Each structure stands twice: as C-alpha cells, then as structure tokens.
C-alpha cells in the first residue's frame, strides 16, 4: 500500500462526487442535518434528519438510519449501496446516534429525549438510550432479523449522572462494541486543579478558564467528559452498556468523537469544541482505561468564533468549533487524511488534506473559498490495493438556503507526480 510521502503543490488528488448514492433528494428542497457516516469492513451505516424549512428549526420530514455495502461501482470507484433503511417511529425523539459494525450487523445507539437535545436540556433528560440492530445484508423475514431494538438491562455510568453516545462511529473487538460517548458530571463534583491549566505562554488566559470551559457555559450545571460506551454481546441475554471515561491527558470539553481501526489499531479522534483548537487524535494505547497517545500536530486546526478561532492554543471560555475528523492511512509515517475548513473564523472552504504532524503534504479544494460548509466525516479503506477515502462534507446550497451532505471518494495517490 504505497502513497506519496512528499509535500507537493501538484494537484495529484482527484476526488469524485459520489453523493448520488445517498438518499438525498435535492429537488425536494429540504434541509438535511445531523449526518452520520460509519464504514467498517465492506459495509457502511448512514443517518440523517430531513427537514422542510430552516436547518435549525424546519419541521422534520424524516429521520433515516440506513446500512449497506461499499462496492466498486463498476469503474474502480467506490460507492455507497444502501440495502436496509429504517425510519425511527417518532423521529423527533431520536438524538446523537452512533454506529459500530459487528458480524453482519450494524448496531446504532441513539439517545431518546422528549425534552430536546440532551446536551441543552441536560438536567431534565431521562437519560434513556435506544440500541437498534440492522442487518447489512437483509433477508426476507417475518420478524426482527433485519431490524430490531435491544434491551439495555443496565447502564453503568459510575459517578456520572447521565451518559450518551456522542459521535458517528465506533469499533468492535471480538464481540465487544465501543461507541464514542460523553458523560454528564455534576460540575460541583468535578475535581480539577487550576494550576494544571496551561496559561503560562498566554497573557490574557486565566487559570479558571480550563475548568470553566469544561461545560457549555461557565455556570453549566454539568461538565462533559468524552469516552466510550462498551457493549459486550457475549455477556448475558441482555448486555449492559458501561461508560468508560477518557484519560485527563489533554482534556477538553466532551465533544463528538470517533474511534476507528486503522491498519490494525484503534485511533481516537475528539472534535475541538473549545480552546484547544489544534486537532486532537492519535493511537489508542488502552481502550478500557481509555488513554490516547495524542498527536502533537502543528498544522491542522478548525475554524472557530472570535474567542477560540483556528490555531488558538490559549485557554479560553468558549464552546464553538466544528467536527472535522481525520483518518490515519499510513502508520509508518503517521500520514492521515481529512476534509478541513480552510478558514480561521468562518465555516467555509472545505479542503481534502493529506498531512503529517508538522506538514500538510497535499490538498484538493472541494469547493470554492467562499463556500459555506460544516461537519466532515472521513473513512479510508482498501479497494483492490488502492487506498481510498470517502468523505462526507456538509455543504451550503445557496439556491435553497439549506445545507446538504456531499460525498467525495478520493483515491490517495501512489505517486507524487
């Protein structure tokens, strides 16, 4: 599996638009929000919420959770071929779905909330979760093989009041599924040392800021800590979910995260939703005591607002940013790939980027510099020995004043010229 290891102004990445595969009807005129794209083996899970009207508050038309195969579409280009689609009854109660694939089934764990987004109405949230299993290769049946919902006998959340899936994709190890998650911890019970917060090189930074921005506001009742939710299929007739907190090395507010096998090992990515705006991801050293050997990356960051803009590294009170994940594609050189919004303070201009810790190797702009965009989900795999990445990129449609997900399949280039 050989790819260019040299920085090169050449336009050697040539992405293909394969969004036609997904269930997006542009002609409907609808906003498509809350996307999820998970790929493992030859299979993928996909989800979105389709709205008539504004993306924030237009009326929900449908929530889709679908699974299928990633196949060579006929010309050595991968496409998504959806085979099994479930529309949740009561679309408005389903939030924060996360997907892990094991043994011919994709399992999606979703928060259920009749009080709104659990992150925003967190003290009133029931805490209840739903686990849905979808066959990737369905079969003619009279019951639930193709789709059924499971019983979570218990939820072991430890000292947290509430735990929740929080991010698109997880991993399997044996029969144990690990979803990216977040724990809600009462702020008064959050033990932290202000001296630890890194204000040494920052003149306007204050010691309180790191603790204060572990919540969505300085006076939030809860703080959010990222982690994993563990589901051992080979454990009782109805298994329990067990929350597993992330280590406190390079701690940031709990945010949409992702854990993925790449080249034989799990990698963890955490979105930077506050002041540590440099990309947070790296090899998982241990899963159950979750500790991530974070990359010390000096080139990739995300756009923010005025308080925590791109390239900010000084502690600050802020809850802003965008989920732009990255996929390791060569562990010998630690080269990774992702789509990043190449702007300091506005959510615009998606650029597909192949990069090292201290160097962007090569890039393709997928749209114009003025083109508004948001969430980005990248997944890479082999197709007949070719490293391919499929990136979902939320892009703004100025004609309908809405946002819609576009899919790019991008072959990583073997040769720099």
């Amino acid at each position, epitope marked *: 599996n050989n790819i260019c290891l040299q920085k090169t102004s050449n336009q050697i990445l040539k992405p293909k638009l394969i969004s036609y595969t997904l269930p997006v009807v542009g002609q*409907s005129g609808t906003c498509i929000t809350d996307p999820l794209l998970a790929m493992d083996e030859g299979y993928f899970a996909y989800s979105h919420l389709e709205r008539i*009207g*504004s993306c*924030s*508050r237009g009326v929900s038309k449908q929530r889709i959770i679908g699974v299928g195969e990633v196949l060579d579409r006929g010309d050595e280009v991968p496409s998504l071929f959806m085979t099994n689609v479930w529309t949740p009854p009561n679309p408005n109660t389903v939030y924060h779905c996360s997907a892990v694939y094991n043994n011919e089934f994709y399992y999606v764990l979703c928060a259920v909330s009749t009080v709104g*987004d659990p992150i925003l109405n967190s003290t009133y949230w029931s805490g209840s979760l739903m686990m849905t299993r979808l066959a990737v290769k369905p079969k003619s049946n009279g019951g639930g093989y193709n789709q059924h919902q499971l019983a979570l006998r218990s939820i072991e959340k430890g000292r947290y009041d509430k735990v929740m899936p929080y991010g698109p994709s997880g991993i399997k190890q044996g029969d144990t599924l690990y979803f990216p998650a977040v724990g809600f911890l009462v702020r008064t019970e959050f033990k932290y040392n202000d001296s630890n917060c890194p204000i040494t090189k920052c003149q306007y930074s204050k010691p309180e800021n790191c603790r204060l921005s572990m919540g969505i506001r300085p006076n939030s009742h809860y703080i959010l800590r990222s982690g994993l939710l563990k589901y051992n299929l080979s454990d009782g007739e109805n298994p329990k979910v067990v929350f597993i907190e992330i280590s406190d090395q390079r701690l940031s507010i709990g945010s949409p995260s992702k854990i993925y096998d790449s080249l034989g090992q799990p990698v963890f990515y955490q979105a930077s939703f506050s002041w540590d705006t440099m990309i947070k991801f790296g090899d998982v050293l241990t899963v159950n005591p979750l500790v991530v050997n974070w990359r010390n990356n000096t080139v990739i960051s995300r756009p923010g*607002q005025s308080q925590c803009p791109r390239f900010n590294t000084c502690p600050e009170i802020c809850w802003e940013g965008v989920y732009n994940d990255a996929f390791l594609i060569d562990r010998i050189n630690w080269i990774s790939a992702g789509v990043f919004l190449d702007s300091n303070q506005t959510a615009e201009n998606p650029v597909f980027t192949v990069f090292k810790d201290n160097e962007i190797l090569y890039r393709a702009q997928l749209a114009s510099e003025d083109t508004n965009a948001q*969430k980005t989900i990248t997944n890479c795999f082999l197709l007949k020995n070719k490293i391919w990445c499929i990136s979902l990129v939320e892009i703004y449609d100025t004609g309908d004043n809405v946002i819609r997900p576009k899919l790019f399949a991008v072959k990583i280039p073997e040769q720099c010229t």
Partner: antibody, heavy 116, light 113 residues
Framework: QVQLKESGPGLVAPSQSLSITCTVS????????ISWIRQPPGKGLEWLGV???????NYNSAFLSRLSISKDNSKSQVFLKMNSLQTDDTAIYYC??????????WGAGTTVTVSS | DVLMTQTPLSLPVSLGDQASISCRSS???????????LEWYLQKPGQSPQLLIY???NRFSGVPDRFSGSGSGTDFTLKINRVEAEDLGLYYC?????????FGGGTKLEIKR
C-alpha cells in the same frame, strides 16, 4: 423570559467601524439561528446577516465586504462588526431571533449615528 | 434582489372597518420545498417590529383572528377587519424564500376618528 439585548457605541465616526454586542436570555444560540436587521431613520427595515447555530454565516451581498457576524455560545453573546461606516449606515440596529425563516423575537434595537 | 412593493404608503381607516394592504414580489416566491415564505410584520409606535403572518396565511402565536393573510404567486394581501385602535402602526411584508431576505417599503395605517 426570552430577551435579546443590543449594546452599541451610539456614535461612530465616518470611515471607522461599528461593533454591536447582543446578549441573549432564555434560549441557546446552538438552539436558534440569529439574524441582524437595521432600520434607517425614517426609512424601512433592511436585513444584513444571519449566524446559524452551527456557525455558518450568510450575509446580504451588499454588506459582504464590510460586514462580519460572530457569536460566543458560552457567554450567550452574538456580535456584529461593520467597517467603512458612512451617514447612510446611521440606523437603529436590531438583533433578532429566527424560527423557521421568520423572526419570532426582536431586540429593542441600538441607535447608531455616523458623525464626526 | 427579490423586490417587495407595498401598494398603499398610507392607509386611513375607521374603527370597525376593513383595512387591506398589498404586497407584490418581483419574482416567484415559492421555494423548492413548495412553501412560500411570505411574512407580515407590524411595528407599533415606539416598538420593535413583531410577527403577524408567516407562510402567507399562518397567524403567528397570539395574533388575533381578524388579521388575515392571503396571496398567490407574487400577489399577497393582508386584511385587518374590524380595525381596532391598537392596530395603528407600520406594516411590512417580507420574503425569506430567497437570500437576501427582503422587506417591503412599509404601509402606515392611520385611524380615522
């Protein structure tokens, strides 16, 4: 108690820049999109820009060179910045809350006068 | 870039009579979603504008039933039957089917007494 409150400078010299801070109460900036509207004195209402819950920003084409909209989710503050201000710019400036492409709630407005 | 024209700059009306304001859009205002986002707002003296009608004929929460929006294509009218004194002010139509959103020039309702 859902309210939008606008703090502005009152007076702005020609060619210098206008900065307004809107503090929002009873709602989450992540929950609702926020838009900026201005009334020129005597003259009718005009729409300048919107900041989405995600942070996507959409602006009137006319003010795109001179207008920036930003938000702090943690401090519940939305910020409007404008540049190269002129007498035509003098107006009451409104921070508005949007539901389904309609303005449900409106700030009281801040009066901005361009003058030396 | 989509222009909204309000036909009566000034409307004088007696109490209990019916006031009728017109709004023309320079283009079709139907969205791909198939909803026409035409809204009517009132500004009473001394106050910020407030929403009356959205999606052509829907009364915003709290608006009395004597306020009424109709329209088709590019012609919209708001009717206030049994006009009450507290109705006096400035009425604006507004479209959010196209960015940039645009307002009409306004209509001042005056009460004949």
């Amino acid at each position: 108690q859902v309210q939008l409150k606008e703090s502005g400078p009152g007076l702005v010299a020609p060619s210098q820049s206008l900065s307004i801070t809107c503090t929002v109460s009873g709602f989450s900036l992540t929950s609702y999109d926020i838009s900026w509207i201005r009334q020129p004195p005597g003259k009718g209402l005009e729409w300048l820009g919107v900041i989405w819950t995600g942070g996507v920003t959409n602006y009137n084409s006319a003010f795109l060179s001179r207008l920036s909209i930003s938000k702090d989710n943690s401090k519940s503050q939305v910020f409007l910045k404008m540049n190269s201000l002129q007498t035509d710019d003098t107006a009451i400036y409104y921070c508005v809350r949007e539901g389904d492409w309609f303005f449900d709630v409106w700030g009281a407005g801040t009066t901005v006068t361009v003058s030396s | 870039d989509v222009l909204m024209t309000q036909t009566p700059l000034s409307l004088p009306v007696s109490l209990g009579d019916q006031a009728s304001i017109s709004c023309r859009s320079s283009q079709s205002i139907v969205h791909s979603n198939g909803n026409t986002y035409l809204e009517w707002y009132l500004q009473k003296p001394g106050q910020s504008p407030q929403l009356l009608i959205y999606k052509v004929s829907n009364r915003f929460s709290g608006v009395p039933d004597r306020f009424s929006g109709s329209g088709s294509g590019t012609d919209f009218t708001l009717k206030i039957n049994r006009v009450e004194a507290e109705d006096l002010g400035l009425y604006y139509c507004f479209q959010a089917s196209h960015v940039p959103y645009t307002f009409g020039g306004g209509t001042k309702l005056e009460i004949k007494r």
